């Protein structure tokens, strides 16, 4: 696992000044394959037009010549970089598939393989930190492997290293959710990781310190983070809205354990409780099946808000009595 | 040329395509006599090639024939696309008296050679000679 290296900067490219021919784009050039003749003909026509203009044609010819000699190598370097990037992507996908097949089909004990597990975690930590919001293709292969790994889980020293990385891994997830990076598929995996972390790891002085510091990370982002999660719900995707809805349950649940709560208050300001009670209408149409499990998390969340004293104020003002009557479920 | 460029240079390309003998060679390549002579020349006993010298004329002739076949297989599409219609239009417009030497049934070069089964056998047997170019 030494082929993932960003020091070479295969994505970054030094762009020369290009005082001339700057407007000549690679439109007709483009399977990423930029043809060189499509730009050669254009620059030749432009040189012919400039020569016909009769304005310092002999002197400025060498400038156009060297600009073309630089543009050809620029195109070749871009093609080589694209090839290297797709090759690295394929290799990373193959490695991730191999690691998944190895972890899944493994009857051997886990306490001896804990060393290799920690080594893989240490190796992927910098990979995730370097590609947290750069590209949405490599994180996918590396995001799902961490998901299953978290569910398939001297002892004191190991317990500290695990909990330490699980806390660091929790930060990069909320950081991506606050910026709405990647596709809804990748954004869904982050919800499952943070879900079990806030449900199993945190849930006794050691517990208080972890719970206290955990809430600090959530408060750092504020409404910016919750706004993204609230938008994912009742969306186009079927699995993203489900994971996002269940995620909110863990946030409000762990917050009460820490008579009021800032998480529930933010949901009201973002108009989340309002639209949520509105969706209660026509619930009979929505209700193993993906739609059934989604509604379960929906009604389950509302049940939690009705347990705190402050929830009755915001929930009652939503006029939920008239919303459940139009559906005729009773 | 005709779609973007002017119609001045078009006459040059037309004259080049009409006077160059490539069209006539391609037309002759679709004849049964030519392919029969070729497969007869390539079909020879193995003892002769084994006892022959690397500079023997038989090996050179076989190499040249294989190269001509490769060039024909490469240029058949270009010909059938950008030669036949132009030549036919020119013959229809102007007055030219030419005798056809091609077979309309052979729509492609493979139709005239798909009837020879010993060709692949001979090509495979010729791999045990050691000649790099021929192999």
């Amino acid at each position: 696992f030494d082929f993932i290296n960003t020091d070479y900067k295969w994505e970054e490219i030094p762009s020369p000044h290009f005082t001339y021919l700057k407007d000549l784009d690679l439109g007709p050039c483009i399977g990423v394959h930029y043809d060189i003749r499509k730009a050669q003909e254009i620059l030749a026509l432009k040189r012919k037009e400039y020569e016909h203009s009769q304005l310092a044609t002999p002197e400025f010819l060498e400038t156009v010549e060297l600009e073309e000699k630089v543009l050809i190598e620029w195109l070749t370097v871009r093609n080589r970089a694209n090839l290297l990037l797709t090759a690295r992507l394929n290799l990373l996908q193959a490695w991730a598939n191999l690691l998944l097949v190895m972890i899944e089909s493994n009857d051997f004990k886990s306490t001896p393989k804990m060393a290799f597990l920690l080594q893989a975690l240490q190796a992927i930590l910098p990979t995730l930190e370097a590609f947290s919001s750069l590209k949405s293709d490599e994180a996918f292969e590396l995001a799902r492997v961490a998901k299953v790994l978290l569910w398939k889980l001297e002892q004191f020293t190991v317990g500290n290293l695990i909990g330490d990385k699980l806390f660091q891994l929790f930060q990069l997830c909320l950081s991506a959710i606050s910026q709405c990076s990647g596709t809804p598929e990748l954004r869904s995996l982050y919800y499952s990781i943070c879900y079990r972390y806030l449900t199993a790891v945190v849930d006794t002085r050691s517990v208080t310190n972890a719970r206290a510091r955990t809430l600090k990370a959530i408060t750092l982002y504020g409404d910016r983070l919750l706004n993204v999660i609230c938008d994912d719900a009742y969306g186009s995707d079927t699995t993203c809205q489900t994971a996002a809805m269940i995620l909110l349950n863990a946030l409000v649940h762990t917050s009460r354990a820490s008579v009021d709560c800032p998480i529930i208050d933010a949901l009201n300001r973002l108009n989340f409780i309002g639209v949520l009670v509105d969706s209660l209408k026509e619930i009979l149409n929505e209700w193993a099946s993906p739609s059934q499990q989604y509604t379960s998390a929906k009604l389950a969340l509302l049940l939690q808000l009705c347990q705190t004293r402050q929830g009755a104020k915001y929930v009652l003002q939503a006029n939920l009595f008239r919303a459940l009557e139009q559906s005729g479920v009773f | 040329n005709i779609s973007i460029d002017d119609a001045m240079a078009a006459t040059n390309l037309a004259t080049y395509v009409r006077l160059h003998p490539f069209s006539r060679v391609m037309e002759w390549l679709f004849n049964e006599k030519v392919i029969t002579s070729l497969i007869n020349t390539i079909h020879q006993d193995p003892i002769s090639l084994g006892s022959a010298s690397p500079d023997s004329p038989l090996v050179v002739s076989i190499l040249r024939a294989i190269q001509v076949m490769i060039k024909a297989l490469e240029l058949q599409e270009t010909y059938l696309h950008l030669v036949r219609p132009e030549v036919l239009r020119y013959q229809g417009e102007a007055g030219v008296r030419r005798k056809p030497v091609a077979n309309a049934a052979y729509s492609a070069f493979e139709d005239g050679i798909l009837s020879h089964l010993s060709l692949v056998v001979d090509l495979g047997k010729y791999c045990n000679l050691g000649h790099a170019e021929l192999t």
Binding site: Y20, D23, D25, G27, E41, I42, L43, A44, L45, K46, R47, K48, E49, Y50, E51, H52, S53, Q54, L55, A56, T57, P58, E59, F60, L61, V64, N271, G274, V275 | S3, I4, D5, D6, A7
Partner: protein
Amino acid sequence: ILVPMTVNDQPIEKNGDKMPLKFKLGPLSYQNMAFITAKDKYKLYPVRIPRLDTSKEFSAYVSGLFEIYRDLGDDRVFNVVNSNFAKEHNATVNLAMEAILNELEVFIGRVKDQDGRVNRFYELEESLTVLNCLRTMYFILDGQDVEENRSEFIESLLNWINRSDGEPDEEYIEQVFSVAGKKVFETQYFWKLLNQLVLRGLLSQAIGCIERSDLLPYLSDTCAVSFDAVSDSIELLKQYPKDSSSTFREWKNLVLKLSQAFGSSATDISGELRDYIEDFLLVIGGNQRKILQYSRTWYESFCGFLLYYIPSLELSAEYLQMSLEANVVDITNDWEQPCVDIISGKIHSILPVMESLDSCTAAFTAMICEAKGLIENIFEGLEDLFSYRNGMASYMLNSFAFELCSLGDKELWPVAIGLIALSATGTRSAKKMVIAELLPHYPFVTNDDIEWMLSICVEWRLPEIAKEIYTTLGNIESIANFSLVKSYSWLLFEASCMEGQKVLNAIVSKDDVIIPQDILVTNSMRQTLAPYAVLSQFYDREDWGQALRLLLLLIEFHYLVLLVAKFLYPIFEDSVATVIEVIETKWSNLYETIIEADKSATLLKNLRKKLNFKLCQAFM
């Protein structure tokens, strides 16, 4: 359009023998000429083409728009990464529409500030209003409804309306906040001007006009009931939704609740103020009847309808109709009808009129209208572009280019050629021909200008053009710089004559490094050889080598031969003899003159010298 040729000296008076007037269009738009072929009419009248823009502001405008055109890339075209190409296409195009709008606003600004004539400012603003409306209706929602993007839409709409006309101008705010014959602020005027503000989305000002007179006064005292209405109404105004079509759904709720509550309640105020408060609440609630009642112009109605009743363009057809039933289109200004047309679906047939207001704007307008796909080339057929064969937009752009070529501003020539080159239609060869004919007229002065011309001749492959341009440049130092076949030969001959008569250039031929690089032809080589020979001369065997070189040069080439003979005489083995012989074998007025100058008969002297040389060879 009738313009006075010269609002000073008019060359005619009575029908007194209708005089032969003559006119010739010049290579420069701003410099044409008129004159008369008649007795006692010997004046020349320089005329510039009517309504021509020479201003710097204009060229700035043009450059900005060309930038927008160029930057549009592949998106300046419309394809009649699957379902997104459409949405993203509209995204960028719609943005370009905003850019154009901006550039035009800036332009209009700079016209109001630096100006002799402000008529141009007015026309440009009108053009802007109509364009704002066009964007608001076709360049934001991409065929969808306001829910698709409530924020952007209402922003553009509110913008369009409050830039079309000036009213309510603050010169009218104080107009009523001054007028009396009534108690404080409570006549049809205050309210009309409050409702007007609301209908135009000008909520800030609206609020201000209230906290101006009787918010707390007459109400907080007289009727505590209506005070609460007039107050939390101002609160709702303070929070009119502009991002969520949900928040609006609930907003109109609170508003209708307020209007019902007040609707049937404690009337502790004047008979008129009662209704005057109800109407305000109705208008805010979206009562159609009322929105029409307090509207001065159709666009106030239309805007109100969209803001407070139902925010759906599916009703625009109806809205406009009601609006026009209330207030007819005001033919005072040129933008209202076009806006009505936009809103009501018929976008087209505006290009000719805009072309009358300003050729440039019209050109790019047609262009972006083609980009959106609002107009396309229906033609389906003659080896060239400037016709109806291609688009209507292509046509207008190409036309603009050609118009720019006669403007004589070298800053815009790149825009002209670029416009032609990027024209989404037409053979590369057709464009080649067009550029081949335009370029020679480029008003080059600098070195850079010329280099630009050349670069375009290269880029398009116009060697015959470049050759001509250069020919124009060629027409002692200039000649040196130039160093067609005949000319080169003449230059050679001149160099030879100079050598026979006998600095940096000569050394270069044989700052300095740059020159050597640039240099890196037969005439040149000969001159270099002559220079080397002279150098050798200045520096016995060397002298012989130089003489040999000279004889060789003479063989390759009358005056030169004479100079050589003179040199030989001044100097006065087998190879030398052979050379002398060849020269004798080879052996008019100018030559004789040169000979006379040298002496200060020739053939005889030459023969004598040859004889002497032969004798010398024999002695050796």
